[PDB]
Amino acid sequence: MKIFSESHKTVFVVDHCPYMAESCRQHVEFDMLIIPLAPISKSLWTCSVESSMEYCRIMYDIFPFKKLVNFIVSDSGAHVLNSWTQEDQNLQELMAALAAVGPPNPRADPECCSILHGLVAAVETLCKITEYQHEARTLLMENAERVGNRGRIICITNAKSDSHVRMLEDCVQETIHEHNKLAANSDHLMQIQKCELVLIHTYPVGEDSLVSDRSKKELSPVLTSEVHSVRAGRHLATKLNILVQQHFDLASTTITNIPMYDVELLHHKDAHVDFLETITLKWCTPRTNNIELHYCTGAYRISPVDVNSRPSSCLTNFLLNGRSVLLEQPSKVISHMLSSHGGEIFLHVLSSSRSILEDPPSISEGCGGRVTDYRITDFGEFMRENRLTPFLDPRYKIDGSLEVPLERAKDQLEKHTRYWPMIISQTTIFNMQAVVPLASVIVKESLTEEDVLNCQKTIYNLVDMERKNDPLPISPKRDEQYRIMWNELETLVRAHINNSEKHQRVLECLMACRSKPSLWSNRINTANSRKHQEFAGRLNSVNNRAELYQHL
Amino acid sequence: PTVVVMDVSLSMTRPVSIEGSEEYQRKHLAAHGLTMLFEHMATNYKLEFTALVVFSSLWELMVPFTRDYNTLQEALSNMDDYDKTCLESALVGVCNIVQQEWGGAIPCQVVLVTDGCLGIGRGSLRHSLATQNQRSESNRFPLPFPFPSKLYIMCMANLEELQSTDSLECLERLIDLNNGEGQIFTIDGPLCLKNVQSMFGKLIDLAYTPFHAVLKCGHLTADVQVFPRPEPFVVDEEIDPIPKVINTDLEIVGFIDIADISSPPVLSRHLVLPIALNKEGDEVGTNSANQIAGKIPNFCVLLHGSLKVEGMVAIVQLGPEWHGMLYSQADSKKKSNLMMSLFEPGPEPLPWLGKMAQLGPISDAKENPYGEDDNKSPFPLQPKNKRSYAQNVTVWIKPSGLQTDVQKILRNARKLPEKTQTFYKELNRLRKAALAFGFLDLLKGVADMLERECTLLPETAHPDAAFQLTHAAQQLKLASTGTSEYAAYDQNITPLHTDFSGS
């Protein structure tokens, strides 16, 4: 049930008909501190398509692998092509398909000047088997992707009147249903039993307006019609920001104090944990100067909108390296977090507690404390067998049939801690080089019955040393040092005795060679049913009598 | 933070049916007992300040950010009367005052505090407060406020009295207009401060459990113990989600470069401290007896090691193939550090290292870019494949978008092509958008004028710039045809070396 995400299908549609080709009076001058100098007749449809494509890219960045979407625009013809790869799910392939489909063109074809081909192109642009198997996708996108972008089809045209707008919408809906049925001709797609439509209407600024105020309603069972108005400029930016926020129930955050103009930071709906979510806080680069420790919760990808500005771009550059951004108000408390990877940028919502990960300034009084002269030999012996390296997928490389790499890694980790105390400061017998072989063979790559034979040889050498009557340094009497060494060896072997049977057998052998140490009816039924348990004599009695002392 | 609504109203200066609660005024009842406005913060939400304000029409607030419930009790006792009565307006003002006094970004929980027994007619307070179904020109009104809080109007009386006074009806209408601000008035009769406490007890949403757990890690001298339950996230639904509990154990397996890739996101702070369990019966992982084992050495506390000199990071892989690295401190004479942490909760714990579902041995090792030494640093792979968060497309949702994008494309020398690996990719996205949209028609203004600014020299100059800019201009004009055209978006235009210079 994990394949029902909000970003299942999203389609942005832009046409090239004469109705949508009208000038939107969009002029922007960048001149402030071989062609004629024509005015910039930018269309509002281009900005609307850009905002919808940005929302679709954010949706793709929400679900990178399980859900994939593409973008195709409308033209004289129709070029539909879709795949199912996880790598191609990124917005680069959607932009490539949108470019390959067709851009806006003032001069349309001499015939077939309508939105039927555009409706077919938009239906093909919609994912989940070209809007045929997208019934459940649209069922979920009834309040998610609808508040985000278009999702289904975005038909921009200069409506002459309400009747003309309704007729054009009906024609586009019929063409989209026909394209969905054509997609449904395949086997992986199912025919549409029900239809859900979220319609986006775009009109040029300063153009004809013959539309009356209305709310969002499912106009027809075949197609549900919705109409919205968007301006050009700051109003377009506000509408796009509201749409982006409503797409995933996100908020706005500003990052300041870059360690060397609106600032927004997107996220998912995981901010409910840190609420009771416009995080107002500065930005911290993880280093020695500033505290680099803070709690992280609910990692979710973030696509910055204000990247064409110094603060947001600086924050993105700092986070994208791999540092952990802490938070402070604008005893340490962090109400936010930011982590990112090599290509992925993400923001996190943090709880205000548990930012004391680097708590212990000294370790003198703790368990396993003020002794750092640990046994390097045991650690090296464990490292001799320790060879772990992941791959794209597990594979069978060694014996034991199709061995799982996780199982082999777990066995390697387990073999590293059979009988091998990697701490030498506790004892004084660690000075000898012939006793380390028992600790090494448990964790060496050659752990086998031969390792047990080598351990037996080490025990024989130790027996020869014991017979030699040689006192050993403690680094009191030599007997105290010998007792400490024997107790340490016993402690090392005790965990191995419960870990394997071979170690237990070795300890038993060593101990063997150790020295120098209907009211009547219902009432009667209720009364009888309340009885709890019979006993042996009553059921086995015969002629109202039963025998006793039967064992004889 | 905390939000307290002290009903200082002239309407809220009379008994309910016959007499007050503590045989006296509302101030005496408030002194005798209070609602859950302070008990929840006293018990659970310790890190919270309250704004003890008694007000109806104007912000007569004198209490700054403070957690003293005595000030709240004094203010509630001081809520004698005023020259206004409006439950929704009082809730809005209390929320605004709490936000302005206790903390701007700190969440709080306000409720409606007024009598409301004005009568339907010329002085109904719901008419002048429940105004949300019109005024499209002023749709961005104070309702909803910039803070998550559900204002609730208390109701504990007879059904006939509640219907005649239209308390529950107005409260439900306000909740419906405000989309759930107010619980269902499922209460009747002579009820004490239980419905009010239940409706005002939602200010303890940031609590915590001070518990402990243990783990077993075999017979090594450096063990690890799981931390408390982490924050749930959308990773794998499976049958159904539920709050986590104390995890059984983890496993420290693997070794990767420390400074090269660092580690994935942490879930909680878990220190590194050795334990032991060999033959003591059930054998619990090892009270204040740690000093005796403290004398015994253990490498868990001293787990710095090759974190800096050789470039190694202690990777820990859980039972269900949940791998993840962690770095340590470098200084040892000074304060050192060691810890344990989880991986990222997203679709991939390490997006710069591919999929990590196969945390296993090196018997089938596909690649070893680091090998616990950081010998090679080919990750992240800049060409072609990359995460979907930073695709080759511009963003204009905010004001610093397309208008600034055109200037950035015109002035690409400032922020390109130096940091073209993973950070600076605005110029490439702008060029891809220009080549895709076919902006030849709009080239006469500022849409495609970036290229002309970089070609102010004569036509007989060096051909390196012409070779560099040949592809974009040629590909751009094909999109105006409205047919199949160039698709140079999956492939990325990377930084070409400018070695044609003589010096």
Side-chain angles (χ1 to χ4, degrees), chain A residues 18 21 36 38-39 64 77-78 96-97 99-100 102-104 106 108 110 118 121-122 136 142 144 148 151 159 183-184 204 206 221 232-233 237 251 259 271 286 298-299 304 311 322 330 342-343 360-361 366 368-369 380 390 394 400 405 409 421 434 437 439 471 473 476 495 512 517-552, chain B residues 1 15 20 30-31 33 42 51 64 75 90 93 103-105 107 116 119 121 123 130 142 144 146 148 157 180 182 189-190 201 207 210 213 218 222 228 230 232 241 243 254 259 264-265 274 276 281 285 289 293-294 297 305 311 314 319-320 324 330 345-347 349 351 354 357 360-361 365 369 371 378 380 383 390 399 401 413 417 433-434 436 438 445 447 458 461 463 465-466 472-473 479 482 487-488 495 502:
Chain A
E142 258 150 25
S518 274
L519 76 165
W520 204 63
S521 71
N522 86 290
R523 184 185 167 86
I524 215 164
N525 175 57
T526 316
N528 293 341
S529 305
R530 278 177 213 276
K531 301 161 67 179
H532 78 289
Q533 185 140 13
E534 281 256 11
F535 36 82
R538 195 157 313 290
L539 265 288
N540 303 335
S541 158
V542 175
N543 227 4
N544 309 324
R545 191 170 177 179
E547 59 152 17
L548 307 173
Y549 313 98
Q550 298 105 347
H551 64 291
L552 303 181

mmCIF file of all heavy atoms in Angstrom, chain A residues 78-97, unseen atoms left out:
data_model
loop_
_atom_site.group_PDB
_atom_site.id
_atom_site.type_symbol
_atom_site.label_atom_id
_atom_site.label_comp_id
_atom_site.label_asym_id
_atom_site.label_seq_id
_atom_site.Cartn_x
_atom_site.Cartn_y
_atom_site.Cartn_z
ATOM 1 N N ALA A 78 1.450 15.138 -32.057
ATOM 2 C CA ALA A 78 1.423 14.510 -30.738
ATOM 3 C C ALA A 78 2.545 13.489 -30.672
ATOM 4 O O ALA A 78 2.587 12.564 -31.489
ATOM 5 C CB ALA A 78 0.071 13.847 -30.467
ATOM 6 N N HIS A 79 3.446 13.653 -29.707
ATOM 7 C CA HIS A 79 4.547 12.725 -29.475
ATOM 8 C C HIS A 79 4.449 12.252 -28.032
ATOM 9 O O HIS A 79 4.719 13.021 -27.102
ATOM 10 C CB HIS A 79 5.897 13.384 -29.754
ATOM 11 N N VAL A 80 4.066 10.992 -27.844
ATOM 12 C CA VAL A 80 3.881 10.406 -26.521
ATOM 13 C C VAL A 80 4.883 9.274 -26.345
ATOM 14 O O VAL A 80 4.965 8.373 -27.190
ATOM 15 C CB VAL A 80 2.442 9.898 -26.323
ATOM 16 N N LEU A 81 5.645 9.328 -25.255
ATOM 17 C CA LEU A 81 6.641 8.304 -24.946
ATOM 18 C C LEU A 81 6.881 8.315 -23.445
ATOM 19 O O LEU A 81 7.201 9.367 -22.882
ATOM 20 C CB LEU A 81 7.943 8.554 -25.708
ATOM 21 N N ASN A 82 6.725 7.161 -22.797
ATOM 22 C CA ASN A 82 6.922 7.055 -21.358
ATOM 23 C C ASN A 82 7.625 5.745 -21.030
ATOM 24 O O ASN A 82 7.486 4.751 -21.747
ATOM 25 C CB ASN A 82 5.588 7.142 -20.600
ATOM 26 N N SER A 83 8.380 5.756 -19.935
ATOM 27 C CA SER A 83 9.128 4.599 -19.458
ATOM 28 C C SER A 83 8.740 4.290 -18.009
ATOM 29 O O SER A 83 7.816 4.888 -17.450
ATOM 30 C CB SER A 83 10.633 4.839 -19.600
ATOM 31 N N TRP A 84 9.461 3.339 -17.401
ATOM 32 C CA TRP A 84 9.199 2.917 -16.028
ATOM 33 C C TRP A 84 10.471 2.820 -15.189
ATOM 34 O O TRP A 84 10.465 2.159 -14.145
ATOM 35 C CB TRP A 84 8.459 1.577 -16.010
ATOM 36 N N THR A 85 11.561 3.448 -15.621
ATOM 37 C CA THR A 85 12.814 3.394 -14.878
ATOM 38 C C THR A 85 12.807 4.369 -13.704
ATOM 39 O O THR A 85 12.162 5.421 -13.739
ATOM 40 C CB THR A 85 13.996 3.705 -15.797
ATOM 41 N N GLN A 86 13.541 4.002 -12.648
ATOM 42 C CA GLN A 86 13.632 4.843 -11.458
ATOM 43 C C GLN A 86 14.545 6.047 -11.677
ATOM 44 O O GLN A 86 14.282 7.129 -11.142
ATOM 45 C CB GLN A 86 14.122 4.017 -10.269
ATOM 46 N N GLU A 87 15.641 5.862 -12.419
ATOM 47 C CA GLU A 87 16.583 6.952 -12.664
ATOM 48 C C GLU A 87 15.955 8.066 -13.495
ATOM 49 O O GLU A 87 16.182 9.253 -13.229
ATOM 50 C CB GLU A 87 17.838 6.416 -13.352
ATOM 51 N N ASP A 88 15.158 7.703 -14.503
ATOM 52 C CA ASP A 88 14.534 8.675 -15.394
ATOM 53 C C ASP A 88 13.396 9.450 -14.739
ATOM 54 O O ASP A 88 12.847 10.355 -15.376
ATOM 55 C CB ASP A 88 14.020 7.972 -16.652
ATOM 56 N N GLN A 89 13.021 9.107 -13.502
ATOM 57 C CA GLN A 89 11.906 9.756 -12.816
ATOM 58 C C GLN A 89 12.146 11.238 -12.552
ATOM 59 O O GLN A 89 11.177 11.974 -12.327
ATOM 60 C CB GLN A 89 11.622 9.043 -11.495
ATOM 61 N N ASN A 90 13.403 11.682 -12.551
ATOM 62 C CA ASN A 90 13.753 13.073 -12.286
ATOM 63 C C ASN A 90 13.132 14.011 -13.322
ATOM 64 O O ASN A 90 12.716 13.600 -14.409
ATOM 65 C CB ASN A 90 15.273 13.244 -12.268
ATOM 66 N N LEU A 91 13.074 15.297 -12.966
ATOM 67 C CA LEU A 91 12.397 16.290 -13.795
ATOM 68 C C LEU A 91 13.150 16.617 -15.079
ATOM 69 O O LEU A 91 12.587 17.300 -15.944
ATOM 70 C CB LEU A 91 12.174 17.572 -12.992
ATOM 71 N N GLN A 92 14.396 16.153 -15.221
ATOM 72 C CA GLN A 92 15.143 16.373 -16.456
ATOM 73 C C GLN A 92 14.477 15.680 -17.637
ATOM 74 O O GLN A 92 14.371 16.255 -18.728
ATOM 75 C CB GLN A 92 16.584 15.890 -16.288
ATOM 76 N N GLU A 93 13.984 14.455 -17.430
ATOM 77 C CA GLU A 93 13.330 13.739 -18.520
ATOM 78 C C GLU A 93 11.959 14.324 -18.828
ATOM 79 O O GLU A 93 11.534 14.325 -19.989
ATOM 80 C CB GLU A 93 13.208 12.254 -18.174
ATOM 81 N N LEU A 94 11.272 14.856 -17.814
ATOM 82 C CA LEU A 94 10.005 15.540 -18.048
ATOM 83 C C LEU A 94 10.210 16.812 -18.862
ATOM 84 O O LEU A 94 9.438 17.096 -19.785
ATOM 85 C CB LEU A 94 9.325 15.855 -16.716
ATOM 86 N N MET A 95 11.250 17.586 -18.532
ATOM 87 C CA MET A 95 11.574 18.778 -19.312
ATOM 88 C C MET A 95 11.992 18.419 -20.734
ATOM 89 O O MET A 95 11.648 19.131 -21.686
ATOM 90 C CB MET A 95 12.674 19.577 -18.615
ATOM 91 N N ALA A 96 12.746 17.325 -20.896
ATOM 92 C CA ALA A 96 13.131 16.870 -22.230
ATOM 93 C C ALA A 96 11.914 16.477 -23.061
ATOM 94 O O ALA A 96 11.825 16.822 -24.245
ATOM 95 C CB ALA A 96 14.108 15.699 -22.123
ATOM 96 N N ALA A 97 10.968 15.752 -22.456
ATOM 97 C CA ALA A 97 9.744 15.377 -23.160
ATOM 98 C C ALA A 97 8.901 16.601 -23.503
ATOM 99 O O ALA A 97 8.309 16.666 -24.589
ATOM 100 C CB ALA A 97 8.940 14.383 -22.324
#
